[PDB]
Structures are given as C-alpha cells and as structure tokens.
Amino acid sequence: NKPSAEELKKNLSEMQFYVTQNHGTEPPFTGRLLHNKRDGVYHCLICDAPLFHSQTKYDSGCGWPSFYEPVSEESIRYIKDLSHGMQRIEIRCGNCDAHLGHVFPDGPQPTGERYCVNSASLRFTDGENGEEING
Ligand SMILES: [Zn+2]
C-alpha cells in the first residue's frame, strides 16, 4: 500500500477495503464504473498509479469492469489464485499490491486477454477536466 494501513482503514469505504486489502470481490454487476464510457484513465484507488485507459475497456457481460490490456507491462502483478474453488490468475497493482481482480484468456484481439477488475479498486480520472471519482 502507498498510505499507511491506518489511513486506508479510515479513508476507504468498507467495500473498498474489503476488495483492495482483503482480496475480496465486489458483487457482480454492481460496480459504479461497470458501464462508464467516458474518456479517461483508471488509476489504482490506493496509490493512483495508472492501470487502464478507457480505450481498452469493453462490455464483457461478466459482471465487472473489463479491459483488454493495461497501460504498461509493469503496471500489473500476476499471482496464481486458488480461491473460491477455482484456479485463476489474480491481478494486483504492480506499485502497491492492491488486489484488482483476475485476468482471463477469453478477451478480444489483439491480446486475447480479459482483465476482470473491481470498480472498487479503481479511481477514474475524466479526460475532459481531470475530475476524479472513486469506483
Ligand atoms: Zn496501487
């Protein structure tokens, strides 16, 4: 994490702490940014590192914000995840290790990757004016 664990517990909503710090998943189809179509950048809620640009976002129908690639190779950390009786690849913020979601091999071209990401893990910075909203 970029801030102290004390600052996070006091500034994060219960859902945002659960997702980013406790490896939780926000309920499917409830994320604030699920159907956002505005131009801008999705940053890590915790440390504000850029993670995904709006141009890579698409409507997968899977339950959560979906992107086909991150802004850079080093932006994301990949971990084997056996939670929930499944075998998946967990994605975390490469800078602060906040939990983001998972990556799947069923995405569109060119990557063929679906980056499944909790709205609660993201801060969206609007390309029109720099206005920021927490997911
Ligand atoms: Zn981060």
Swiss-Prot record:
Record-annotated active site: C116 (nucleophile)
Any single Gene Ontology cellular-component annotation: cytoplasm
BP-aspect Gene Ontology terms: protein repair; response to cadmium ion; response to oxidative stress
Molecular-function annotations in GO: iron ion binding; L-methionine-(R)-S-oxide reductase activity; peptide-methionine (R)-S-oxide reductase activity; zinc ion binding
Co-factor binding comment: Binds 1 zinc ion per subunit. The zinc ion is important for the structural integrity of the protein.
Catalytic activity line of the entry: L-methionyl-[protein] + [thioredoxin]-disulfide + H2O = L-methionyl-(R)-S-oxide-[protein] + [thioredoxin]-dithiol
Domain MsrB: 5-127
Gene3D superfamilies tied to this protein: Peptide methionine sulfoxide reductase
This protein's UniProt keywords: Metal-binding, Oxidoreductase, Zinc
UniProt binding sites for Zn(2+): C44, C47, C93, C96
InterPro entries (UniProt xref): Met_Sox_Rdtase_MsrB (IPR028427), Met_Sox_Rdtase_MsrB_dom (IPR002579), Mss4-like_sf (IPR011057)
Family membership: Belongs to the MsrB Met sulfoxide reductase family.
Record's protein name: Peptide methionine sulfoxide reductase MsrB
